[PDB]
Design an enzyme around this catalytic site. Sequence first.
Site, short mmCIF file in Angstrom:
data_model
loop_
_atom_site.label_atom_id
_atom_site.label_comp_id
_atom_site.label_asym_id
_atom_site.label_seq_id
_atom_site.Cartn_x
_atom_site.Cartn_y
_atom_site.Cartn_z
N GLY A 105 0.74 -1.12 0.03
CA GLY A 105 0.02 0.10 -0.03
C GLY A 105 0.76 1.30 -0.04
CE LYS B 255 6.07 2.55 -2.05
NZ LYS B 255 6.73 2.50 -3.36
CG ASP C 107 -7.09 5.87 9.05
OD1 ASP C 107 -8.17 6.28 8.23
OD2 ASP C 107 -6.17 5.32 8.46
N1 LIG Z 1 -3.81 -2.95 7.77
C1 LIG Z 1 -3.64 -2.54 6.86
C2 LIG Z 1 -3.28 -2.19 5.38
C3 LIG Z 1 -1.86 -2.37 4.78
N2 LIG Z 1 -1.42 -3.78 5.24
C4 LIG Z 1 -0.62 -4.28 6.12
C5 LIG Z 1 -0.42 -5.60 5.94
C6 LIG Z 1 0.38 -6.69 6.48
N3 LIG Z 1 0.86 -6.39 7.68
O1 LIG Z 1 0.52 -7.72 6.06
C7 LIG Z 1 -1.04 -5.96 4.71
N4 LIG Z 1 -1.39 -7.07 4.07
C8 LIG Z 1 -1.45 -7.25 2.73
O2 LIG Z 1 -1.87 -6.23 2.19
C9 LIG Z 1 -1.27 -8.75 2.43
C10 LIG Z 1 -2.51 -9.14 1.19
C11 LIG Z 1 -0.95 -8.82 1.04
N5 LIG Z 1 -1.71 -4.78 4.11
C12 LIG Z 1 -1.18 -1.42 5.65
C13 LIG Z 1 -1.57 0.00 5.28
N6 LIG Z 1 -1.15 0.30 4.02
C14 LIG Z 1 -1.56 1.95 3.85
C15 LIG Z 1 -0.49 2.84 4.21
C16 LIG Z 1 0.68 2.69 3.52
C17 LIG Z 1 1.50 3.78 4.05
C18 LIG Z 1 1.39 4.61 5.31
C19 LIG Z 1 2.33 5.51 5.52
C20 LIG Z 1 3.52 5.16 5.65
C21 LIG Z 1 4.57 6.30 6.05
C22 LIG Z 1 4.08 7.47 6.56
C23 LIG Z 1 2.84 7.68 6.39
C24 LIG Z 1 1.92 6.89 6.09
C25 LIG Z 1 0.20 4.49 5.89
C26 LIG Z 1 -0.83 3.58 5.34
C27 LIG Z 1 -1.83 -0.39 3.26
C28 LIG Z 1 -1.73 -2.02 3.64
F1 LIG Z 1 -0.36 -2.16 3.12
#
Ligand SMILES: N#CC[C@]1(n2cc(C(N)=O)c(NC(=O)C3CC3)n2)CCN(Cc2ccc(-c3ccccc3)cc2)C[C@H]1F
Lengths: 281, 286
Positions: A18, A24, A130
Amino acid sequence: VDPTHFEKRFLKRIRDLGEGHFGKVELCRYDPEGDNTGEQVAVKSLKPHIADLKKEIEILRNLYHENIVKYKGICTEGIKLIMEFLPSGSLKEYLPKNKNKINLKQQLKYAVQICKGMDYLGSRQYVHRDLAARNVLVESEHQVKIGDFGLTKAIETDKEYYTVKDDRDSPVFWYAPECLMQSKFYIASDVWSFGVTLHELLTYCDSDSSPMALFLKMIGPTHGQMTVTRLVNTLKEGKRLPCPPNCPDEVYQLMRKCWEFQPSNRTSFQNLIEGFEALLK
Amino acid sequence: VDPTHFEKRFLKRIRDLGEGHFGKVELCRYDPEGDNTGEQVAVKSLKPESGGNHIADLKKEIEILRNLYHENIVKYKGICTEGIKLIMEFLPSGSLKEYLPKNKNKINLKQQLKYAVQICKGMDYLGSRQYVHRDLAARNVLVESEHQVKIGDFGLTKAIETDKEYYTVKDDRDSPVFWYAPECLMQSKFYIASDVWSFGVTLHELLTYCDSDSSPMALFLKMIGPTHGQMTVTRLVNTLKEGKRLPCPPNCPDEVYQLMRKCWEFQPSNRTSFQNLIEGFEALLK
Ligand SMILES: N#CC[C@]1(n2cc(C(N)=O)c(NC(=O)C3CC3)n2)CCN(Cc2ccc(-c3ccccc3)cc2)C[C@H]1F
Ligand SMILES: N#CC[C@]1(n2cc(C(N)=O)c(NC(=O)C3CC3)n2)CCN(Cc2ccc(-c3ccccc3)cc2)C[C@H]1F
């Protein structure tokens, strides 16, 4: 050796999970043996904010609950947050693909698990700000975990809310009135966000029945910079998201108590857990 | 020969005077003799786009202005049909936004108050004909002469129904939010007293000689935050609820600032009127 220190030279990128505007979350393999047998981890990092990510790291390192994603460690040069990887991903990913496996009983048990994670967070004097389906990870068919704390704030002792300034990029369709009108975040404001997240879970996170899609149908999709004042207007007039298809009226009534206009009315997470547990007997 | 009929073949485009999302105003010369001695005119028309019906609204605009006759309202000249065009007189001095920053030395407070009076008489005439303007700003006040201004654009003007106090609007994409009254930002209801609030902001602009660093947008954003994006309006409504207003312009006497503050009562019912403002200014000019 510190088991929470990940060396940069062994943290091998597989792909993006994400992003937001400032950084990211990547899937990596921590592979010190160089043979692709290392554990997979989720790595949060900034684009080339630093203080805020340090704060986020310090919050998650100190949260221990079976319905909160596990902190694993940090990579330092700039800093990276290392978390457990949940290959099923979020409820927004998983529900549309697994409708046939996930019936109402299992939806009600995910709702209880989310409420227990949120109640644990509130007990440590934190407001999440959030809570949405895209931030609830699937550990297994039977278990979910809150998976992101990028907006989490401490409420000072004696106070009931935290006031925010950095409100560009607000998830307005999940926000309580007091959050839209005055940028004030209470524990009760996460209860309101939980109600919207419940709505998503019961619609199996379909795009055409999203809180955003449905609210825009209510107020108009044109509007632009007037969108939020029109949203506050329709919440003021007493209007809420409609009952999800196939959702029993008594599940809908617990949802509606998340959405009392006044924060001091709204249900607690503990009351929601008891409401759902009564429906599961 | 209909003198309000302008033939496309004689209407020679010179340059753009202004643009909005859906249309423009252009400087043309109507030159039937083909020797560049014809009159200059300002020409409102639609960009080829159109749809949710820009054409219907532009034809309403034309019928509103054709039937307004006041020395402080820009003159209708005619139409060009071909996608209709609204032909108006051209005022080479442009708006207060173009003219005041260039003419500070020539325009003193006495002349500023006379311009205030003339806008109020224009506005009072529009409210007498049961219309709400909804876009009163210095950029829409044209300079005829050092001695005379005219309201020069009617693109948002609406009829208040007989027996009704307000008009409610739906297309609020592109609202001049820093000129709008609380009841406009909160519920998209537009009263005569809403144009009084916009007049107050327009007076503030005139007293600051339309300088860009003292604009209503520049000063409100400094109060609430230049950040905020999609939350800008709810922060503005918040600021207004708490009772904050644009500050007294440099060199503005308190008695003029007090007339401006009566424009900005939170409730429409508590605001001054245009005829009250005329009386207020005329008392200051004696
Ligand atoms: N929750 C949840 C969703 C997330 N996730 C985490 C996982 C995991 N741990 O396995 C995951 N597992 C998958 O997808 C498996 C199917 C493949 N997904 C984690 C959030 N990000 C969004 C996002 C990205 C960056 C920042 C950011 C970064 C730096 C400064 C300020 C903002 C904020 C939010 C989206 C997803 F990656
Ligand atoms: N008022 C005033 C200001 C305007 N003006 C008019 C004149 C004039 N008559 O002499 C003028 N004279 C100069 O500038 C003299 C210095 C050279 N200026 C007229 C408004 N437009 C803005 C605008 C443009 C299009 C539409 C529109 C069109 C179709 C559909 C939907 C919207 C709405 C508003 C800006 C100016 F052109």
